[PDB]
Amino acid sequence: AYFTGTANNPADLLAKVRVHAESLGWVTDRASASEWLCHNADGYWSFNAGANQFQMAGNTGFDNSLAWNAQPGNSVQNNPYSSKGPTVAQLSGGPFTRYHLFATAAYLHLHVEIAAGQFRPVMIGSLNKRGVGYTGGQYVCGSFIYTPGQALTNNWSSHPFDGYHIQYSNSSCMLRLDGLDGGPSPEWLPFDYTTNVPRRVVGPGRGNYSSQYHPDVGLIDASANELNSSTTTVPCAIYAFGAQQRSRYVGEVPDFGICNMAFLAPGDPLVVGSDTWRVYPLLQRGTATDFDSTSAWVGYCFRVV
Amino acid sequence: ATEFGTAVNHADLVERLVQFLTASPDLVAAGQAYEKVFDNTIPASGTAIAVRQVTLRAPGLGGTDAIYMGIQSYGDTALDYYNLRLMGGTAFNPGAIPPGGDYWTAFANYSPRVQLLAWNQPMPYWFFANGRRFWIVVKVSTIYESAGAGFILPPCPPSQYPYPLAVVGSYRGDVATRWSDVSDRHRGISSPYERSCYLRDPAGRWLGFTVDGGAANESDYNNRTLLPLGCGRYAGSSDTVVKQLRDSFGKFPLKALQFVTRETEGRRYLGDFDGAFYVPTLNSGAEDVIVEDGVDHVVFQTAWRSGNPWLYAIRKD
Amino acid sequence: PPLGFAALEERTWTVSIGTDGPPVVNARIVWRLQGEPNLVLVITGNRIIAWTFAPDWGDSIVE
């Protein structure tokens, strides 16, 4: 359920998380020291560990003779992007202060502290269908940094579930929505807003950025109550745009929520009822208006069981 | 808890409203009926319809709460409007009324009045009520009106905030308006504008909420809005997701309505509407019954127009 | 303990902490109800007794 540890290199994180998944019963079609082709009852996925970053890509079929980025129905070729690039999660090289792993039968959530104040989230799973009849719902997200030293959260940067970004090569996170507007079933929709592609998805990823496109941004901003210092979680609603800019709500991120960290320190617990929640900063602790060098006060909330 | 039908006139509509509130099988069986603490007709009607004033007390679901509400039936035959004015408060005392004047001033921490527009004619009506809140929707027959008041559901202990009273109406009750008005200020509960919705702060000061700004309105209420329909605060384009919302594969999503304030002193999340939601307009519209988990919700549209951002659904249980 | 709670009713008990008990307070009070996971209220602390004797000081006090 809840796991913690340390990893000097990413490969150690690979080994530990794969060990946990196997112990939990997750089925790995193929395993290797650096390349993974695993799956579950919901969807197929593939991961590769680089020198200082992860490469993730969705999948629909299996073929052991194909490369990690050439599986049947792979996202690389079945995406509107002309670059045809898979999901990327940029990290650092060397010590990772600590990693926090949430494991279940339907999704995996990971939060790695590469260094003091630096956090890199890795998110994978399937959206809660919430009684909505649709094929897909698998989402894979990664963390990307534009440039160290300069503004870390520039406009060009991309974040999990991001609703606003500028980049032509790689996407931080993505989603599956099969048979959209009568198209072929294999469809891996990326989280983009400026490409004007007929089909796209959007999310509250950035939190409360100035040009974030989501109607709940106010809820995330007001998650904290001054009068009683109470904090409430906000489910992350995802929206998908049709061929003629007609949005259709798809679902919410299971066991996930966002809030403001104005009056909460990293890891501060607020047990609201029988179920406990863990809150951690997205990238680093900063000030309210530091939307360039850090992630401001946006905090990711996970349900711990 | 629901009273659908057609009222021969506004006076008969109010009579049916009070009869439902006092004799509904669900209310009487559960002992949630409201108590009429006042009922009088003070004015001497000249070229106008008789004005009925009623004050009623609601004990809440638990019977430990104290809710005071008022309803007024003000009309003018020479202008052929028979407005129904609504207001809320916390205490009532007939002796505190100054000579002449009006009784609504006697309410402790009195609040500005809202109203619903109707006239003397057969009129289909849609009624919802519960121990904590009541909703009125009057179908003008090719126009739809709506209003209501009650307790919102905050995320904080009622021990510290036991009076989250909210009052909402289609138009401000400070002036007399004809139901055929052609001003943007005439709208519904989902999108208050120009003194169309009030909520009582825990400090005891009533705060108005508007989804859109207005020069005429006070500067203080600009910072406090309804986020679901006020997405324009953060979005950098006129067109957003909310205006383009649509049903998914024959299924209509329901979005709640939020009460949020962003003040310089601090921020605070107040609560949600109990039984009211935002829904799209496509392939649907008024008098549409949408089920959910065995619960039915009725669809309604604002008087202004019937477009995507001016349409909402109300739970009928 | 058996206590029926009215709807929309908050019942604030008066938790009186006495002055007699073990020097180490290791308490685990369980609020067990049907159809709800156990919600144990854990009270922790220590019990101490204060020295309330005024000593004569004709001889200087040595620190």
Coordinates of C-alpha atoms in Angstrom, one line a residue, chain A residues 117-294:
Chain A
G117 CA 13.4 20.2 -1.7
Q118 CA 13.3 18.6 -5.2
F119 CA 10.5 16.2 -6.0
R120 CA 9.7 14.3 -9.2
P121 CA 6.2 12.6 -9.4
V122 CA 5.5 9.5 -11.6
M123 CA 1.9 8.7 -12.1
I124 CA 0.3 5.6 -13.8
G125 CA -3.0 3.9 -13.6
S126 CA -6.6 4.1 -15.0
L127 CA -9.2 6.8 -14.4
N128 CA -12.2 5.8 -12.3
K129 CA -14.9 5.1 -14.9
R130 CA -17.6 6.5 -12.5
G131 CA -20.3 4.6 -14.4
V132 CA -19.2 6.2 -17.7
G133 CA -19.2 3.7 -20.6
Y134 CA -15.9 4.3 -22.5
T135 CA -13.0 2.1 -23.6
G136 CA -9.6 3.2 -22.3
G137 CA -9.0 5.6 -19.4
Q138 CA -5.3 4.6 -19.0
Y139 CA -3.1 7.6 -18.1
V140 CA 0.7 7.8 -17.9
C141 CA 2.3 11.0 -16.7
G142 CA 5.8 12.3 -16.2
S143 CA 7.8 15.3 -14.9
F144 CA 9.7 17.6 -17.2
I145 CA 12.0 20.5 -16.3
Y146 CA 12.8 23.2 -18.8
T147 CA 16.2 24.5 -17.7
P148 CA 18.0 24.4 -14.3
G149 CA 19.1 27.7 -12.9
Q150 CA 16.5 29.7 -14.9
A151 CA 12.8 29.7 -14.2
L152 CA 12.0 26.0 -13.5
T153 CA 8.3 26.4 -14.2
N154 CA 8.5 28.4 -17.5
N155 CA 5.6 28.3 -19.9
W156 CA 7.4 25.8 -22.2
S157 CA 7.5 23.4 -19.2
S158 CA 5.1 20.5 -19.0
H159 CA 3.7 18.8 -15.9
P160 CA 1.4 15.8 -15.2
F161 CA -2.1 16.5 -16.3
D162 CA -0.9 19.9 -17.5
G163 CA -3.6 22.2 -19.1
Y164 CA -1.1 24.6 -20.7
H165 CA 2.3 24.0 -22.2
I166 CA 4.5 25.0 -25.2
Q167 CA 6.6 22.1 -26.6
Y168 CA 6.7 20.4 -30.0
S169 CA 8.7 17.2 -29.1
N170 CA 7.7 15.5 -25.9
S171 CA 4.6 15.4 -23.7
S172 CA 4.6 15.1 -19.9
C173 CA 1.3 13.1 -19.6
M174 CA -1.3 11.5 -21.9
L175 CA -4.6 9.6 -21.8
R176 CA -6.4 6.9 -23.8
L177 CA -9.9 7.5 -25.3
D178 CA -10.7 4.8 -27.9
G179 CA -13.1 5.4 -30.8
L180 CA -13.2 9.2 -30.5
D181 CA -15.3 10.8 -33.3
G182 CA -15.4 7.5 -35.2
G183 CA -11.7 7.1 -35.4
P184 CA -9.7 3.9 -35.0
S185 CA -9.8 2.3 -31.6
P186 CA -6.1 2.9 -30.8
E187 CA -6.0 6.6 -29.7
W188 CA -3.5 8.0 -27.2
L189 CA -4.6 11.6 -26.5
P190 CA -2.0 14.0 -25.2
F191 CA -2.6 16.9 -22.8
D192 CA -2.1 19.9 -25.1
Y193 CA -4.0 23.1 -25.6
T194 CA -2.1 25.3 -28.1
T195 CA -1.8 22.8 -31.0
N196 CA -5.5 23.3 -32.1
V197 CA -5.6 19.5 -32.9
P198 CA -9.2 18.4 -33.4
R199 CA -8.9 15.9 -30.5
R200 CA -7.1 16.7 -27.3
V201 CA -7.4 16.5 -23.5
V202 CA -6.8 19.0 -20.7
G203 CA -6.3 18.7 -16.9
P204 CA -5.6 20.8 -13.7
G205 CA -2.0 19.6 -13.8
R206 CA -0.2 22.9 -13.2
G207 CA -2.5 23.7 -10.3
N208 CA -3.2 27.4 -10.1
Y209 CA -1.1 28.9 -12.9
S210 CA -2.1 32.2 -14.3
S211 CA -3.0 30.7 -17.8
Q212 CA -4.2 27.3 -16.5
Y213 CA -7.4 26.2 -18.4
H214 CA -9.7 24.4 -16.0
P215 CA -12.9 25.6 -14.1
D216 CA -11.7 24.2 -10.8
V217 CA -8.5 26.4 -10.5
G218 CA -10.5 28.5 -8.1
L219 CA -11.3 25.4 -6.0
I220 CA -7.6 24.5 -5.9
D221 CA -6.8 28.1 -4.9
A222 CA -9.4 28.2 -2.1
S223 CA -8.8 24.6 -0.9
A224 CA -7.5 26.1 2.4
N225 CA -9.9 27.8 4.8
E226 CA -8.6 30.7 6.8
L227 CA -11.3 30.8 9.5
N228 CA -10.7 27.2 10.7
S229 CA -7.5 26.3 8.9
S230 CA -9.3 23.4 7.3
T231 CA -8.2 22.0 3.9
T232 CA -10.4 20.1 1.5
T233 CA -9.3 18.0 -1.5
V234 CA -10.4 18.6 -5.0
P235 CA -10.8 15.7 -7.5
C236 CA -8.9 16.3 -10.7
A237 CA -11.5 16.5 -13.4
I238 CA -10.3 15.7 -16.9
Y239 CA -11.9 17.1 -20.1
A240 CA -11.6 15.9 -23.6
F241 CA -12.3 18.1 -26.7
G242 CA -14.2 16.7 -29.7
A243 CA -13.6 17.3 -33.4
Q244 CA -15.5 20.6 -33.2
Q245 CA -14.3 21.9 -29.8
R246 CA -17.1 20.2 -27.9
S247 CA -15.9 19.0 -24.4
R248 CA -17.0 15.8 -22.8
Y249 CA -16.1 15.1 -19.2
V250 CA -14.3 11.8 -19.0
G251 CA -13.4 11.0 -15.3
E252 CA -11.3 11.8 -12.3
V253 CA -7.9 10.6 -11.0
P254 CA -8.5 7.8 -8.5
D255 CA -7.3 8.4 -4.9
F256 CA -5.8 11.8 -5.8
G257 CA -6.5 15.4 -5.0
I258 CA -4.9 18.9 -5.0
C259 CA -4.8 21.6 -2.4
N260 CA -2.8 24.7 -1.3
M261 CA 0.2 24.3 0.9
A262 CA 0.1 27.8 2.4
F263 CA -0.4 26.6 5.9
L264 CA 1.0 23.0 5.6
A265 CA 4.6 21.9 5.7
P266 CA 5.8 19.0 3.4
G267 CA 4.3 15.7 4.6
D268 CA 2.1 17.4 7.2
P269 CA -0.8 15.1 8.1
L270 CA -4.4 16.1 8.2
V271 CA -6.5 13.0 9.0
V272 CA -10.0 13.9 7.9
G273 CA -12.1 11.0 9.1
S274 CA -11.5 7.2 8.9
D275 CA -9.2 7.7 5.8
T276 CA -5.9 9.4 6.1
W277 CA -4.2 11.5 3.4
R278 CA -0.6 12.4 2.6
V279 CA 0.3 15.8 1.1
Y280 CA 3.6 16.6 -0.6
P281 CA 4.8 19.5 -2.7
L282 CA 4.9 19.1 -6.5
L283 CA 8.5 20.3 -7.2
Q284 CA 9.7 22.5 -4.3
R285 CA 8.6 24.7 -1.5
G286 CA 8.4 28.4 -2.4
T287 CA 6.2 31.5 -2.0
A288 CA 2.7 32.2 -3.3
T289 CA 3.8 34.1 -6.4
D290 CA 6.9 32.1 -7.3
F291 CA 5.5 30.5 -10.4
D292 CA 8.9 30.7 -12.2
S293 CA 11.6 29.3 -10.0
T294 CA 9.4 26.7 -8.1

